[PDB]
Structures are given as C-alpha cells and as structure tokens.
C-alpha cells in the first residue's frame, strides 16, 4: 500500500489531469458549437433558404456527462455537406449596363 501511494501516477495526479481536461473540454464545446452555428448560417445564406436547420441542440447530454458530443456535430456537418452537394447548381450569368 505504501508503494502504491508513492507512485508517480498516484491519485492526485490523475484527479488534477482529469479536472483540467474537463475544464478544457467544457470551453472547447462552446467554441466548436459557435463555429458550427456560423457554418450553418453560411450554408443558409448560400442556399437562400432560412428554413434548413441541422444543429438541433442536445449535443451535450447530461446522461453521458457530455462525452461524444463531437460525434453529433460531425454527423450534422456531414448532413450539411450532403445537402449542399445535392442541391448545388451552376448559375446562369448576366451582365447589365445602366
């Protein structure tokens, strides 16, 4: 037991590491959700259709303590890319002199 307590990777080190990582994760989630929101706004502007919504919330669910939040954002971005690819079109060009 005494050797177990004097280990380099004792309880205190692990506790501090996971606390710091939890704080970093908590802030990074907000940052990346803001990024996804501005990407969705850009897509809405591109398609000229304000009705499309892909970030529906609930990514940070308390049941999983916020883990695998990023997977939902990845899926939403994949859906956004698929919608953009399918509905894309080459536009006709017109120049007018006034």
């Amino acid at each position: 037991l005494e050797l177990l307590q004097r280990k380099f990777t004792n309880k205190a080190l692990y506790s501090w590491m996971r606390g710091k990582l939890s704080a970093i994760y908590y802030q990074f989630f907000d940052l990346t959700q803001s990024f996804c929101l501005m990407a969705q706004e850009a897509l809405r502007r591109e398609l000229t259709d304000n009705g499309v919504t892909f970030i529906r919330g609930g990514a940070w669910n308390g049941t999983t303590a916020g883990l695998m939040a990023g997977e939902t954002l990845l899926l939403n971005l994949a859906e956004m890319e698929k919608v953009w690819l399918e509905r894309d079109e080459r536009a006709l060009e017109v120049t007018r002199t006034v």
């Binding site: 990582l21 990074f28 929101l37």
Partner: protein, 48 residues
C-alpha cells in the same frame, strides 16, 4: 442480507443560440469546423 442498487436522476441537455454570419464562404468554414470537432473528439477519448 443487504443489497444495493443503482439510482438515476433526470438530466437535461444544451440549448442553441442564434448564429452569426462570417465573411468566408461555406466549404472553408466547413473544413475549419471539421478540424475543431476532430480535436474535441480526441479530448473526449482521452478523458474516458
């Protein structure tokens, strides 16, 4: 003879704020967000 059981409670989820409009087009913003989300996933795996 005693026994024990697991207890669960109601839990909520995050909300969505109105978004903002950036200056770049769609694909570049998509790639930036993809990189950020990959970083977030790595953080979660390390935590677990």
């Amino acid at each position: 003879a005693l026994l024990t059981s697991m207890v669960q409670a109601s839990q909520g989820g995050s909300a969505v704020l109105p978004g903002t409009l950036s200056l770049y087009r769609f694909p570049v913003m998509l790639e930036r967000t993809r990189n950020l989300v990959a970083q977030l996933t790595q953080f979660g795996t390390s935590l677990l």
